[PDB]
Amino acid sequence: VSPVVAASQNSWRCVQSGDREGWLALMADDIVVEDPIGEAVTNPDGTGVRGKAALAAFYDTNIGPNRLRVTCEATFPSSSPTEIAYILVLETTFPNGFVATVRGVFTYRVDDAGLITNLRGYWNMDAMTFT
Amino acid sequence: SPVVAASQNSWRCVQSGDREGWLALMADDIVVEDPIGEAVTNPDGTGVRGKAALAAFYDTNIGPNRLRVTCEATFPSSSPTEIAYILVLETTFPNGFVATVRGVFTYRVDDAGLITNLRGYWNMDAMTFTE
């Protein structure tokens, strides 16, 4: 199993099961989560959430309260064991039974210690759907 | 949208042999990792970096071959400078042999509309061949 695949799918298990430290422990000190890339509801800034500091906050705002579901439709490994792309569908159910769903390309990168330095989502609000 | 026009223009020129048009779209700090990681097309595994290196990459790996592109899917981000595609790249070599690969291709432009990052998530597993 490649390091980027172990890390990336340990991330999916951690966000799906409320394992905040599990999740944070997978992440390098220089982590840059851009879900998605560019300015949006969850990237207000437009330049992503930086360091374990701001990502802890990001979790407690957008993930810790809710039920997040990751579904993998396709894997696109590269020729490097530290970088992969996927087609995921993300599905956040809020406590009021409100459900936001989005399909996108998600790229990952780990450093030489095996920790995520970059999580990057290719999607916009035009693609998100509500139920 | 600058990244769509850059990217669509990349396919125009590459598919028809227009070397000077292809190079015109790239920045002077360009990095092409087709694919990401160690491959014949990316030997040191860190990509072809700089417009000068890219010219010699062109004459080694593109000019002698016929290349055909099929966009199968498009995943815009919430930034106008960065997009991801699913592409099918078909490379006919000088001896008549054809290699075909599906992968994820991400693009990025700088504030002037010029391509700074062309990155391909594929490897040899997925690649097919004929003739």
Side-chain angles (χ1 to χ4, degrees):
Chain A
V1 175
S2 76
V4 83
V5 167
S8 65
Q9 308 188 199
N10 277 326
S11 160
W12 308 345
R13 171 189 41 84
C14 284
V15 302
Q16 287 191 298
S17 76
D19 197 332
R20 181 197 194 270
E21 30 294 308
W23 198 61
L24 260 41
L26 303 168
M27 315 288 336
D29 294 344
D30 61 342
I31 180 63
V32 175
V33 187
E34 305 160 81
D35 191 16
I37 298 161
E39 291 179 9
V41 166
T42 149
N43 191 5
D45 199 14
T47 81
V49 176
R50 314 209 170 210
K52 282 159 136 279
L55 180 75
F58 184 89
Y59 182 95
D60 301 310
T61 306
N62 316 102
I63 294 170
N66 312 138
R67 189 184 79 156
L68 185 51
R69 286 304 147 75
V70 182
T71 288
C72 177
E73 296 215 320
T75 72
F76 292 92
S78 60
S79 300
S80 153
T82 68
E83 295 214 71
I84 187 157
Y86 298 101
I87 306 289
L88 316 183
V89 171
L90 283 68
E91 189 227 60
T92 324
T93 288
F94 297 89
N96 52 302
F98 188 56
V99 179
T101 293
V102 66
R103 194 160 160 287
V105 171
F106 290 75
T107 69
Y108 299 77
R109 181 184 184 296
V110 296
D111 53 22
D112 299 321
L115 301 174
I116 300 162
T117 64
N118 294 259
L119 199 185
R120 288 173 63 91
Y122 292 79
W123 61 265
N124 46 55
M125 294 293 304
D126 269 63
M128 192 163 227
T129 75
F130 304 101
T131 58
Chain B
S1 170
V3 85
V4 174
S7 59
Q8 266 175 203
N9 286 318
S10 194
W11 320 331
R12 299 218 72 69
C13 295
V14 84
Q15 290 195 85
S16 57
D18 189 323
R19 182 182 189 284
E20 314 310 320
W22 198 65
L23 278 87
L25 303 153
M26 308 301 172
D28 305 354
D29 65 336
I30 193 157
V31 177
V32 178
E33 306 164 84
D34 196 11
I36 297 166
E38 253 146 39
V40 354
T41 40
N42 185 5
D44 66 6
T46 182
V48 175
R49 341 194 77 173
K51 224 175 175 204
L54 187 60
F57 175 88
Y58 184 100
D59 297 313
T60 300
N61 295 288
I62 293 161
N65 301 145
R66 209 61 45 196
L67 222 141
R68 180 178 139 246
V69 179
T70 302
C71 191
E72 300 200 321
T74 311
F75 300 89
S77 53
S78 304
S79 170
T81 52
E82 296 194 87
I83 194 168
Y85 299 104
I86 289 185
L87 308 182
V88 169
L89 230 91
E90 189 209 58
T91 304
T92 303
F93 295 102
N95 73 330
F97 174 79
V98 188
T100 293
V101 65
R102 194 178 329 247
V104 162
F105 290 80
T106 64
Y107 295 78
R108 177 174 186 292
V109 295
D110 56 17
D111 45 326
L114 297 185
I115 296 159
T116 60
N117 299 265
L118 194 166
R119 278 161 63 76
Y121 291 75
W122 61 270
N123 62 37
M124 179 134 284
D125 282 18
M127 184 180 266
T128 62
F129 323 95
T130 189
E131 309 192 318

